[PDB]
C-alpha cells in the first residue's frame, strides 16, 4: 500500500475553470469572454506590478552603490528594515579587485567557519576573475603578492537579528586585524530588521566605537513613505478604470489587513486585489458588460437580476414621487480615480508632500471626508476648495463593484482558523447536512463533536476515566446496540453485541479513537511520558 | 580641521593639543580605565568639534576654550513592528514577568450569570523586582489570552479579537526576529505542547514599545 | 547623602572591562577545554549565556568581598562598603 | 430588572413571559427547564430568562425578520419597556453573555435544525459560506421575494 | 463549575486550584478492557456506517468547489485545506481524478507527487530526489555549491531562477497530506516546500490538521506559500493516519 509509504509518484489516466452563471443559463461564449476579460485585466495589472518591482530593486541597488562608493576603519552601512533579498553588485575598479562576501546565520556557527567561507569565496572569486592556499587572513595579507592588485571586500551580513552576536563581534574584531595592510579596504553591510539600538545593546562598547568611525544608516523598508504601495494601488485603479468600482469597505479592509503586516506589505496588497478580481470575474454575470462590445447579448435573466438594485430602487422611487436604460449608462467614466490622481500629483509636486497613503486618501474620498483627511498637513487650507470633490452616485454601480460583504475575502485569505475549527466542533449542524443508520444519526452526535462539548465544559485537567464515564452517559445504550445488530453479515460483531458489556466496549472504542484524534489535533495533552490517566486541555474556544 | 579653522578665522599648537588630551583623560579616565585604545577613540571622536570652538579669543585662554567646549566633556557619546506584533510582545513580557495564578485578578472584567469569585490578588507584594532576573517560560494559549485581554476593541460586531492567521504569522515573525525565544534553538518544532516560550527584550525596549502604542505597562508592575 | 553617578550606558563599558580582566566570569562556565576534540565540540554549540541580553547574564566573582577588604587601603573612598 | 440580584421565580411567570413573544409550548418548557437546571447556582434569574426568551424568539421568528427588518426592533423594544430599563445595551449584552452557555447544548442544536436558522441563514447558505465559495450570495442586492412584494406595493 | 466558558476569562477561570479531597483519582484501570482487533472491528463498522449519508451528501456539496480550486491554482495560489476530519481522500480525488487531466487538457497527463506527512519517515531529501527525477533540473556548478551548503536548497533556488523565465504550464502537482505532520513541520522541510511553492510551474495542494498550524509560517514563508485557505470539515475518521500512533496505550 502506497499510503504506508513516505512518498510516491502517480501517473493518472486522461477547458477553462470558469463556470456557467445565471442559475446555469449563461451562454457558453459569455463564459469564454469573461475568461478573456479576466486574462487581459490581470495581465494589464501585473505588467505594471512587475515593472514597479524592477524599479524598486534598481533604485535600491543604486542607493546602496552610492552609499558604498560615496582611512584605517570599516565602511559600515546599516540597512534598516531589510529582508536580505537585495542583490548587491559592485563596481569594476581599474587595477583593483572588488569582492562581495555574503554571510547568513546558518553559515555562521562560529568564527572559524565564517572566516573559512569568506576566504574560500575570496580566493574562488579572485582566481575566477584573474596553487592552493590556506583559507585564513594571511590570504588577505599576501593578496597583492599573488594577484598583483589591491583588494576591496564588501561583507553583506544577512539576518543579523538571527545571528549570534558574540560570534559576529569576534568576527568583526578578527577583521580589524586586516587594517594593518596597505592594500586592503573593508566595507560591512548589516541588514537590520528591528532597529539599531537593539543591536548596539548586543555588541561590545569597543565594537561600537570601532563601527562609529565611518558608518551610514539607511532606512529602506517596503513600507517606507508609501511610495511603492501607492504605485501598485494606482496601477490597479488604472486597470479597473472605467469598468469597475471600489467600495469604501473594501478599501478599509485593504488598510486594515495591510496594517497587520510590516515586512511584506506589497505582496499582500497584490494578493488581495488579485483575489478580488478573481472573485468578481468568477461570480458576476455582468462581467461581460464591462466593455461596450457586449451590449447585444442581454436576456430576461439579466433584466431580472439587474432590476434588484438599491440604486435602481431609489431611482424609480424618485421617478415615481429597461434594457435601453441599462445600456445608456455605460458611457460614464466615474472620475473619482482621476481626481485622486490629480490630488496625489498636486500634493507630490506643488506642495512637496510625499508622506501620504493613496489607499487612505481613496478611502476618505469614497466616504466624503477628504478635507478631514487633508487637515493633518495644515498646508491645504488655501486649496481645499480646489482639491475637494463631491462623491457622484452612479446608477447600477452595485453590479460593477469590488466589495466584501459576504466574508469571502476574510474566509479565503485571513480566516479565523482555530476559531473555525472550534466552531465546527462545537456546532456541527452547520457542517453535517440534515436528512441504515438514520435512526442513530438523529439521536447520536458525531463522536468528535460530542466529545468536544464535554471537553468545553470540563476543567483544565480532566480525569480520563471520568471523561469516559460522562461520554458513556451521553450515549443511548439501546439504539447503539440495535444499529450494531442491524447488520447480520458480521459474525464477530453479532457475537460481541450479545455480550452484556457491549455498550461500554463500543463507547470505549469510539471514545479512545476520538481521544487520540484530539491528541493529533492538539486539543489535549498527557501529563506524563508513561501514564495515560490525566489530560490537560490546551485549547479554549473564542481565543 | 585645526589648520583650516586657523586660516578661516608651533609650541602653542602643541599646548592646545596636550591640553585637549589632558582634558579628555581627566573627563573620561573613570569611563575608560587605563585603556589606551578607548582614550584614542574618544580623542579621535572629540577633536574636530573641540577644534570648531577655537577662536582668536579662545586660542590663548584655555579655560575659556574649556567653557565653550564643555558639552563634550560631560557625556561620552560613543554610540551610533505592527499593532498586533507590539501587543504580542507586550503580552509576552507580561507572561514572562508575572505569575500565571494572579492572571484572573487583573484582566478579568466580564460579568457573571453563574455564581463565582475571581482571584483576590497578591496579599502582600514581594520586594525582588522580577524584571532584574531572567524571564519565565509560558505556553501559547496563556499568551493568546493575555494578548486578547489587553488588545483594543451591536450583536454581530465581534468585540474581542480572535487569534486568526495574522496573529500566528506575527508570532512566528517575532520568533524569527529573536524578540521571542524558546528553550529549543535548533530543530525546534513549534507545534509540540512541550515547547515553552519566553520574551527576550530588555525592560527599556518593551517600555519604548508600550509607549509607542500608548499602552501603560508600568501600571502592571506597580 | 552623607561623586558623579554614571548611567547604565556608560557602566556597560566598565562591566565589559571587568569581564575582560578576569574579575567576573560566566556562571558554571567550563572555560578552556582540555583537548582539541572537546574544544571542537564546544565551538559547534550555541550557549544559552550568549543569546540573552548582557544585563541578564549570570556572573560569579573571581575575588570575594573579604579579599577586597583585605588589600584595598583603609583611606580609600569606597573602603567602608567592603564590610556589608 | 437586570441589576437587582437573588430572586426566586415560579413556572407561571416564565410561561407568561413566553406568551408575550408567542412561542410554542415545547420551547416554553425548554426555557422552563433551562432556568430550572441552573437555579441554585445563579445570581440573577431575570438575565437568564431574558436571554433564553430572546434567543428563542430570534430563531422562531427568523422568516418574519427576513421579510421585515423592523421585527428585530419590535422584540428588543418590547422587553426594554418590560424590564424597566432605559438604555438598550443591557439586553444585547445579556443575550451575548448567555449565548455562550446555551450554544453547546443538544436541544438548542435541535431547535436550530428544526427551524433552519443557524444564526441567520439556512444550511445551503452556511455550508457555502464556510467552504469559502465565490458563488455564495452577498448582501448587495435585494432578494427575489423582497422585489416581488415591492412590486406588489407599487402596483 | 465556571461562570465563564470560552473567552480569556474562561481560560483564567478554569485554571482554579482544586483540593486534594476533590481530585477524583479514578484511573483507567477500572475501565472495560478490550482486545486489539475488536477495536479495529468496531471502528470499521462505526466509521463505515455511522453518519455516512450526511458525509456523502457533504462531499457532494464540496465537490462543486473543484473549478474554483483549479482557478486558484492556475492563478498562482497554493491551496491549504483544513477542517475537522481526514482530508486524504478529498485531496487524492481532487488532484488525481479532476485537476491533473483538466490541467493537461487546458495546456494542450501531469505527474502527481504525493507526500504522506503523517508518516514520521517522510524525509525531504528522498522527496527532493523524486522532484529531481520528475523535473530534471540543471545540476549545480561548483561555484553554486558554495562551501558545505545545503545542496537541496541551493538547487531549488537555482530552479526558481530557471523557472522564472519558462511558460506558466503546470508540469508537477505536489500533494502534501498533513503539512503540519511530525517530520514535515520541521523548519528545513517547510523552507524546502515554501521555496518549491515559489515556482509557478508546481501546483501545491497541502492540508493541515493541528489547530496551531499557522504558527509554522512567518512573513517570508507565508509570502512564499501564497495560501488560499479552505475549510473542509467532513468528520472523516482518519483511518490511515491513525496507523502511526497506538490506541492501546
UniProtKB/Swiss-Prot annotation, chain A:
InterPro entries registered for this protein in UniProt: EF_Hand_1_Ca_BS, ORC3, ORC3_N, ORC_WH_C
Annotated GO MF terms: chromatin binding; DNA replication origin binding
A single BP term in Gene Ontology: DNA replication initiation
Keyword RNA-binding: no
Keywords associated with the record: Acetylation, DNA replication, DNA-binding, Nucleus
Pfam families with a match to the protein in the record: ORC3_N, ORC_WH_C
GO CC annotation: DNA replication preinitiation complex; nuclear origin of replication recognition complex; nuclear pre-replicative complex; nucleoplasm; nucleus
Protein localization: Nucleus
Main location: nucleus
Quaternary structure note: Component of the origin recognition complex (ORC) composed of at least ORC1, ORC2, ORC3, ORC4, ORC5 and ORC6. Interacts with ORC6.
Function of the protein: Component of the origin recognition complex (ORC) that binds origins of replication. It has a role in both chromosomal replication and mating type transcriptional silencing. Binds to the ARS consensus sequence (ACS) of origins of replication.
Family: Belongs to the ORC3 family.
Protein name (record): Origin recognition complex subunit 3
Source organism: Saccharomyces cerevisiae (strain ATCC 204508 / S288c)
Gene name for this UniProt entry: ORC3
From Swiss-Prot, chain B:
Location relative to the cell: Nucleus
Transmembrane segments: none
Assembly: Component of the origin recognition complex (ORC) composed of at least ORC1, ORC2, ORC3, ORC4, ORC5 and ORC6. Interacts with ORC6. Component of a cullin-RING ligase (CRL)-like complex composed of at least the cullin RTT101, a linker protein MMS1, and the potential substrate receptor ORC5. Interacts with RTT101 and MMS1.
Known role: Component of the origin recognition complex (ORC) that binds origins of replication. It has a role in both chromosomal replication and mating type transcriptional silencing. Binds to the ARS consensus sequence (ACS) of origins of replication. This subunit is a candidate for the mediation of ATP-dependent binding of ORC to origins. May also be a substrate targeting component of a cullin-RING-based E3 ubiquitin-protein ligase complex RTT101(MMS1-ORC5).
More details: Present with 768 molecules/cell in log phase SD medium.
Family affiliation: Belongs to the ORC5 family.
Protein name per its UniProtKB record: Origin recognition complex subunit 5
Gene: ORC5
UniProtKB/Swiss-Prot annotation, chain C:
Gene: ORC4
Segments passing through the bilayer: none
Species of provenance: Saccharomyces cerevisiae (strain ATCC 204508 / S288c) (Baker's yeast)
Protein name (Swiss-Prot/TrEMBL): Origin recognition complex subunit 4
Domain of life: Eukaryota
Quaternary data: Component of the origin recognition complex (ORC) composed of at least ORC1, ORC2, ORC3, ORC4, ORC5 and ORC6.
Other facts: Present with 2170 molecules/cell in log phase SD medium.
Functional note: Component of the origin recognition complex (ORC) that binds origins of replication. It has a role in both chromosomal replication and mating type transcriptional silencing. Binds to the ARS consensus sequence (ACS) of origins of replication.
Subcellular location: Nucleus
Part of the whole protein covered: 424 to 529 of 529
Family stated for the protein in its record: Belongs to the ORC4 family.
From Swiss-Prot, chain E:
Disulfide cross-links: none
Taxonomic superkingdom: Eukaryota
Location in or out of the cell: Nucleus
Function, in words: Component of the origin recognition complex (ORC) that binds origins of replication. It has a role in both chromosomal replication and mating type transcriptional silencing. Binds to the ARS consensus sequence (ACS) of origins of replication.
Self-association and partners: Component of the origin recognition complex (ORC) composed of at least ORC1, ORC2, ORC3, ORC4, ORC5 and ORC6. Interacts with MCM10 and TAH11.
Family statement drawn from the similarity comment of this UniProt entry: Belongs to the ORC2 family.
Misc: Present with 1700 molecules/cell in log phase SD medium.
Protein name: Origin recognition complex subunit 2
Gene assigned in the entry: ORC2
Entire protein: shown range: 236 to 497 of 620
Amino acid at each position: 500500500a502506497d499510503a504506508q509509504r513516505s512518498h510516491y509518484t502517480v501517473y493518472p489516466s486522461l477547458h477553462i475553470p470558469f463556470v456557467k452563471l445565471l442559475s446555469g443559463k449563461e451562454s457558453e461564449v459569455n463564459v469564454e469572454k469573461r475568461w478573456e476579460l479576466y486574462h487581459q485585466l490581470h495581465s494589464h495589472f501585473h505588467d505594471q506590478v512587475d515593472h514597479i518591482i524592477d524599479n524598486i530593486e534598481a533604485d535600491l541597488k543604486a542607493e546602496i552603490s552610492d552609499l558604498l562608493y560615496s582611512r584605517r576603519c570599516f565602511n559600515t552601512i546599516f540597512l534598516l528594515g531589510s529582508d536580505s533579498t537585495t542583490k548587491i553588485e559592485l563596481k569594476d575598479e581599474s587595477s583593483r579587485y572588488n569582492v562581495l562576501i555574503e554571510l547568513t546565520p546558518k553559515e555562521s556557527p562560529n568564527v572559524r567557519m565564517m572566516l573559512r567561507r569568506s576566504m574560500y569565496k575570496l580566493y574562488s572569486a579572485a582566481d575566477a576573475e584573474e596553487n592552493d592556499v590556506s583559507y585564513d587572513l594571511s590570504l588577505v595579507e599576501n593578496f597583492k603578492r599573488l594577484f598583483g592588485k589591491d583588494l576591496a571586500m564588501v561583507f553583506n551580513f544577512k539576518d543579523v537579528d538571527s545571528i549570534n552576536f558574540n560570534t559576529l563581534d569576534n568576527f568583526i574584531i578578527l577583521l580589524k586585524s586586516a587594517f594593518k595592510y596597505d592594500h586592503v579596504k573593508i566595507s560591512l553591510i548589516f541588514n537590520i530588521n528591528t532597529n539599531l539600538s537593539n543591536i548596539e545593546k548586543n555588541l561590545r562598547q569597543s565594537t561600537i566605537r570601532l563601527l562609529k568611525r565611518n558608518y551610514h544608516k539607511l532606512d529602506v523598508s517596503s513600507n517606507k513613505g508609501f511610495k511603492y504601495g501607492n504605485q501598485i494601488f494606482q496601477s490597479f485603479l488604472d486597470t479597473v478604470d472605467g469598468k469597475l468600482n471600489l467600495s469604501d469597505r473594501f478599501v478599509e479592509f485593504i488598510l486594515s489587513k495591510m496594517a497587520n503586516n510590516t515586512n511584506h506589505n506589497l505582496q499582500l496588497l497584490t494578493k488581495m486585489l488579485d483575489y478580488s478580481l478573481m472573485s468578481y470575474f468568477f461570480q458576476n454575470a455582468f462581467s461581460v458588460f464591462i466593455d461596450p462590445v457586449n451590449v447585444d447579448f442581454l436576456n430576461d435573466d439579466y433584466l431580472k437580476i439587474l432590476s434588484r438594485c438599491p440604486t435602481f430602487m431609489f431611482f424609480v422611487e424618485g421617478l415615481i414621487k429597461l434594457e435601453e436604460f441599462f445600456v445608456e449608462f455605460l458611457v460614464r467614466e466615474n472620475p473619482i480615480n482621476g481626481h485622486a490622481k490629480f490630488v496625489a500629483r498636486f500634493l507630490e509636486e506643488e506642495l512637496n508632500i510625499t508622506n501620504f497613503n493613496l489607499i487612505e486618501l481613496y478611502h476618505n474620498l469614497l466616504i466624503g471626508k477628504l478635507d478631514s483627511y487633508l487637515d493633518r498637513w495644515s498646508a491645504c487650507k488655501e486649496y481645499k476648495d480646489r482639491l475637494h470633490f463631491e462623491p457622484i452616485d452612479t446608477i447600477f454601480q452595485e453590479l460593477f463593484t469590488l466589495d466584501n460583504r459576504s466574508g469571502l475575502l476574510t474566509q479565503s485569505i485571513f480566516p479565523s482558523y482555530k476559531s473555525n475549527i472550534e466552531d465546527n466542533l462545537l456546532s456541527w449542524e452547520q457542517v453535517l447536512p440534515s436528512l441504515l443508520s438514520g435512526d442513530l444519526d438523529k439521536i447520536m452526535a458525531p463522536v468528535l463533536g460530542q466529545l468536544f462539548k464535554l471537553y468545553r465544559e470540563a476543567n483544565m485537567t480532566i480525569n480520563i476515566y471520568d471523561f469516559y464515564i460522562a461520554f458513556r452517559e451521553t450515549l443511548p445504550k439501546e439504539e447503539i446496540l440495535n444499529f450494531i445488530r442491524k447488520d447480520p453479515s458480521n459474525t464477530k460483531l453479532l457475537e460481541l453485541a450479545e455480550t452484556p458489556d457491549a455498550f461500554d466496549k463500543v463507547a470505549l472504542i469510539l471514545f479512545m479513537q476520538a481521544i487520540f484524534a484530539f491528541e493529533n489535533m492538539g486539543l489535549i495533552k498527557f501529563q506524563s511520558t508513561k501514564s495515560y490517566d490525566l489530560v490537560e486541555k490546551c485549547v479554549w474556544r473564542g481565543i | 580641521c585645526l589648520r583650516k579653522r586657523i586660516i578661516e578665522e608651533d609650541d602653542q599648537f602643541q599646548n592646545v593639543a596636550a591640553n585637549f588630551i589632558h582634558l579628555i583623560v581627566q573627563a573620561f579616565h573613570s569611563y575608560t580605565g587605563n585603556d589606551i585604545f578607548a582614550l584614542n577613540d574618544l580623542i579621535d571622536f572629540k577633536w574636530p568639534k573641540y577644534v570648531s570652538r577655537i577662536t582668536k579669543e579662545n586660542i590663548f585662554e584655555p579655560l575659556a576654550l574649556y567653557k565653550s567646549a564643555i558639552k563634550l566633556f560631560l557625556s561620552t557619546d560613543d554610540n551610533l513592528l505592527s499593532i498586533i506584533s507590539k501587543y504580542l510582545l507586550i503580552a509576552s513580557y507580561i507572561c514572562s514577568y508575572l505569575e500565571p495564578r494572579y492572571d484572573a485578578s487583573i484582566f478579568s472584567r466580564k460579568t457573571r450569570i453563574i455564581q463565582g469569585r475571581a482571584a483576590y490578588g497578591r496579599r502582600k507584594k514581594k520586594e525582588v523586582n522580577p524584571r532584574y532576573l531572567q524571564p519565565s517560560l509560558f505556553a501559547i494559549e496563556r499568551l493568546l489570552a493575555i494578548f486578547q485581554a489587553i488588545f483594543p476593541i451591536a450583536l454581530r460586531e465581534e468585540s474581542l479579537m480572535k487569534a486568526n492567521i495574522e496573529v500566528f504569522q506575527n508570532l512566528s515573525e517575532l520568533h524569527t526576529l529573536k524578540l521571542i525565544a524558546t528553550t529549543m534553538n535548533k530543530n525546534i518544532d513549534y507545534l509540540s505542547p512541550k515547547v515553552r516560550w519566553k520574551v527576550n527584550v530588555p525592560w527599556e525596549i518593551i517600555k519604548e514599545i508600550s509607549e509607542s502604542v500608548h499602552f501603560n505597562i508600568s501600571d502592571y508592575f506597580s | 547623602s552623607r561623586i558623579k553617578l554614571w548611567l547604565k550606558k556608560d557602566v556597560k563599558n566598565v562591566w565589559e572591562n571587568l569581564v575582560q580582566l578576569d574579575f567576573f566570569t560566566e556562571k558554571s562556565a567550563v572555560g578552556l577545554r582540555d583537548n582539541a576534540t572537546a574544544a571542537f565540540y564546544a565551538s559547534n554549540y550555541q550557549f544559552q549565556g550568549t543569546m540573552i541580553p548582557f544585563d541578564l547574564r549570570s556572573y560569579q566573582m573571581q575575588i570575594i568581598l573579604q579579599e577586597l577588604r583585605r588589600i584595598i587601603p583603609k583611606s580609600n573612598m569606597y573602603y567602608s562598603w567592603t564590610q556589608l | 430588572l437586570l441589576v437587582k440580584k437573588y430572586c426566586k421565580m415560579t413556572t407561571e411567570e416564565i410561561i407568561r413571559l413566553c406568551n408575550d413573544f408567542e412561542l410554542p409550548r415545547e420551547v416554553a418548557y425548554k426555557i422552563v427547564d433551562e432556568y430550572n437546571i441552573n437555579a441554585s447556582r445563579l445570581v440573577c434569574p431575570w438575565q437568564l430568562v431574558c436571554g433564553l426568551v430572546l434567543n428563542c424568539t430570534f430563531i422562531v421568528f427568523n422568516e418574519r425578520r427576513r421579510k421585515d427588518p423592523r421585527i428585530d426592533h419590535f422584540i428588543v423594544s418590547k422587553m426594554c419597556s418590560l424590564m424597566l430599563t432605559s438604555k438598550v445595551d443591557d439586553v444585547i449584552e445579556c443575550v451575548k453573555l448567555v449565548k455562550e452557555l446555551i450554544i453547546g447544548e443538544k436541544w438548542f442544536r435541535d431547535l436550530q435544525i428544526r427551524y433552519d436558522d443557524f444564526d441567520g441563514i439556512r444550511y445551503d447558505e452556511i455550508i457555502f459560506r464556510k467552504l469559502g465559495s465565490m458563488l455564495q450570495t452577498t448582501n448587495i442586492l435585494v432578494t427575489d421575494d423582497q422585489y416581488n412584494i415591492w412590486k406588489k406595493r407599487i402596483e | 463549575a465556571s461562570s465563564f466558558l470560552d473567552t480569556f476569562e474562561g481560560y483564567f477561570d478554569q485554571r482554579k486550584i482544586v483540593r486534594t479531597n476533590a481530585k477524583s483519582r479514578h484511573t483507567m484501570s477500572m475501565a472495560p478492557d478490550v482486545t486489539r482487533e475488536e477495536f479495529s472491528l468496531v471502528s470499521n463498522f462505526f466509521n463505515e456506517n455511522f453518519q455516512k449519508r450526511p458525509r456523502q451528501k457533504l462531499f457532494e456539496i464540496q465537490k462543486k468547489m473543484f473549478p474554483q480550486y483549479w482557478f486558484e491554482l492556475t492563478q498562482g495560489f497554493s491551496l491549504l485545506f483544513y477542517g475537522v476530519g481526514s482530508k486524504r481522500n478529498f485531496l487524492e480525488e481532487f488532484a488525481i481524478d479532476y485537476l491533473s487531466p483538466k490541467i493537461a487538457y487546458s495546456q494542450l497527463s501531469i505527474p502527481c507527487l504525493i507526500l504522506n506527512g503523517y508518516n514520521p519517515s517522510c524525509n525531504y531529501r528522498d522527496v527532493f530526489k523524486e522532484i529531481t527525477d520528475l523535473l530534471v533540473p540543471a545540476e549545480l556548478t561548483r561555484s553554486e555549491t558554495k562551501y558545505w551548503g545545503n545542496h537541496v536548497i541551493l538547487q531549488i533556488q537555482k530552479m526558481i531562477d530557471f523557472y522564472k523565465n519558462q511558460p506558466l504550464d503546470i508540469k508537477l502537482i505536489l500533494v502534501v497530506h498533513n503539512l503540519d505532520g511530525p517530520s514535515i513541520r520541521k523548519n528545513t522541510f517547510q523552507t524546502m516546500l515554501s521555496f518549491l511553492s515559489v515556482i509557478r510551474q508546481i501546483a501545491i495542494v497541502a492540508s493541515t490538521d493541528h489547530i496551531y498550524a499557522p504558527l509554522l509560517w512567518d512573513n517570508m514563508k507565508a509570502q512564499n506559500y501564497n495560501f488560499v485557505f479552505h475549510d473542509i470539515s467532513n468528520f472523516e475518521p482518519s483511518t490511515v493516519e491513525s496507523t502511526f500512533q497506538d490506541v492501546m496505550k
